Structure 1
Amino acid sequence: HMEAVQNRIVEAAERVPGVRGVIHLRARYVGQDIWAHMIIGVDPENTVEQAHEICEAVQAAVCGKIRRIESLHVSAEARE
């Protein structure tokens, strides 16, 4: 069941403007719910505020598309 969900999470995150791939995704079931931590790539010349905005947009996109996610943390790293 988990691989199909992880595929949906990556696909959803990579559709958000400013995401330069999903660098890392760790998802685990807590019961029927998913809790996940994500690192996305961003343009190194983005501001820290812009990177924060992208992470928030990823959280909204992924949580809106995948109903079973009850916790999602998104961080950013420079990617070239």
Structure 2
Amino acid sequence: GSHMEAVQNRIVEAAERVPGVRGVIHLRARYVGQDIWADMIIGVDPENTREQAHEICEAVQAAVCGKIRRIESLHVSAEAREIGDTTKPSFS
């Protein structure tokens, strides 16, 4: 595809469909054999309270883990973006 890339993009689209998500900021995905362990940073509206931001992260974790075959583990955290800015997901 490359393959990790096709899977990275599927993780991103699954997250980006969760209500409250304003973009995937960063995805780090590591291949343990066939399995994937991931750590994702999502953007959320700066209007959100901390409580609200936490629930968006929990919903992303459930949604991505439910949809993406061989996600062994996923951690999601949140950053308050934007007033505008701006950016396409990055990957490592």
- TM-score bracket, normalised by the shorter chain, equals over 0.9
Aligned pair count?
80
Of 44, 47, 63, the match for 2:46: 44
Shift of the alpha carbon at 1:18?
A: 0.5
Shift of the alpha carbon at 1:23?
A: 0.3
- Between the aligned residues of both structures, percent identity stands at 98
Q: Counterparts of 2:11 and 2:68 in 1: how far apart (Å)?
A: 7
Structure 2 unaligned regions, length at least 5: 83-92
What are the within-5 Å matches in structure 2 for residues 1-80 of structure 1? 1-80=3-82
TM-score (norm 2): 0.85
Shift of the alpha carbon at 1:67?
A: 1.8
Q: Deviations over 1:10-66 (max 9, x none)?
A: 000000001010000000100110000000000111010100000000001100000
What SS does the corresponding residue of 1:71 show, helix, strand or coil? strand
TM-score (norm 1): 0.97
Structure 1 unaligned regions, length at least 5: none
Whose Rg is larger? 2
